[model samples]
Target: STGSATTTPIDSLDDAYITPVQIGTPAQTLNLDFDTGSSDLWVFSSETTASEVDGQTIYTPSKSTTAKLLSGATWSISYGDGSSSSGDVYTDTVSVGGLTVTGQAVESAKKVSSSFTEDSTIDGLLGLAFSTLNTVSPTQQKTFFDNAKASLDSPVFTADLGYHAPGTYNFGFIDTTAYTGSITYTAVSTKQGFWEWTSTGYAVGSGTFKSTSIDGIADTGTTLLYLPATVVSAYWAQVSGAKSSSSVGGYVFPCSATLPSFTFGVGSARIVIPGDYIDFGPISTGSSSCFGGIQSSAGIGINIFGDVALKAAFVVFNGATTPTLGFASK
Candidate 1:
């Protein structure tokens, strides 16, 4: 895990140049998303004609100093936020900071909107998370880290969310100094793309919970935890006289007196969810005060563990040397 460290200069958009793998070639540089929750690297191209593409940087094979289109392949992605894009598959030479890779697979999204075009600072995303959800099939797909993990110094991947501060999202190979302590590693559950796992209930205030167990997935793209309706109801039941309204996604109680601290268990590691995250961005639906992070998505079947939970741990994606991700202490 020891080699030369490559620190690419990050632009204002925090875009990290990555190499997309082609069918025959080894790797090539392409813009990628440094996402923690979801895994996939997609870019806009000339074929897209949906709406005015804004805020996003498009990748043009002709513009790149080194680029190539795959013979028979395509890419399309739709975000949980209701946005979608699709395009042809291509390979190109890309560089990040100072790292350059060749023969990388790149998706050209021709259909884009002004919302995506507005932030033109970044050309694409370099996903530095797990390889389970990679757009490429397990037999043929290869992430930037999968191709370059062994060439770098130390088998580690770090992210610095300091750039965007509180409101914005910034990702990529982050410097470890940004963290306050040693990184802790948690074993991952091999499932369908998502780093699915179970929880031993949650804690409130200083109270410790060790009975009930919860199952869910850790997602960086989502901001809140999506639990089954029964689980949510049970959790709220612990508190005397818990209330809920349809305004805040069916989750939210009136002003309370002493809120308890809560934590989820993964095997033996207890990941704590800060109370502040519990009460994030305020929203006005009907007339009630709604909390951001804590929303009700019961019956959705899928429980999501968002960045709020990730903030409590240091995560590492080692696709370069091994097809595994490690979650640890920070």
Candidate 2:
């Protein structure tokens, strides 16, 4: 069966997105971050250390009659944000928006990094990227979406994220009323286990388009948009007081400066990210220096189109034999 779930923004800054998931037999509902960047469905569980548990709920597999531990199966993940989580695996009845995956691989967290411990809003992550990226050793596990694909009405899912409001994640079907204009479809390359796509071009606010090939991944797991130094430097130059500071990390600008919108092409279509979206927030509390929402991925080694970019459109992740991505403005 198909499914639809409401994804809520975790903080005022929309630091993270989370959707309620029902795990185990009797059903223990836990809010999970449906990350499209990585592939491993993991969560905080009864196995996690007591001190590591704070304002989060734990998944107690023992309470579920259908919960079965996969002997010797383990997983570990290190994120770009310096947070990490690792644990043994268990197969259980995992349900999302009434769609049930009877034997979904659910990795339980035994230990977590300080970053995860501090962020109590999310219980864990449900990876939506290619299954090849799964961290489970000896045998890689399929993602929740991968496992549910065959049974779904259609093997496609859509992400509709909001700037500071709640959005939606729809599986197996696209809601016509959710978007405006026609959807633009593009080929997706999963060679590196990412939702990699080649962008046609880019343009700074009210400027002419630069016809250049820009390759990047659409990652919902990441917080900000990261592009090549050349691209971002061009955009930052438009802001009078923008500084590419090494000490502060990436570009910082005057908090009250007038910002310019960014536009990127998907095939012949141009998706424009509103100017206000670029003013992320102040670097520190009460500081007049604001961090740029879009930063250069220079040291990171990969250009990322994260939440900052994705929120501008309704995105479809097609999981067919030949995967395709579709973008439409909402």
Candidate with top lDDT is 2
Off by over 4 Å in 1: 1-33, 96-98, 113-125, 128-140, 159-184, 234-250, 253-260, 285-288, 320-330
- For model 2, residues 6-94, the per-residue Cα lDDT tens digits are 99999888778999999997999999999999999899989999899889988999999999999899999998877899999999999
Q: Which ten residues in a row have the lowest lDDT in candidate 2?
A: 274-283
Quality of model 1 by C-alpha lDDT: 0.51
Worst 10 residues of 1 by lDDT: 162-171
How well is each residue in 13-127 modelled by candidate 1, as lDDT tens digits?
2122222222222323333444455555667555656465554444556655556667667655566655566566666654444444456566677665454565454445555
What are the per-model C-alpha RMSD values against the true structure? 6.3, 0.9
Q: How many backbone clashes does candidate 2 have?
A: 0
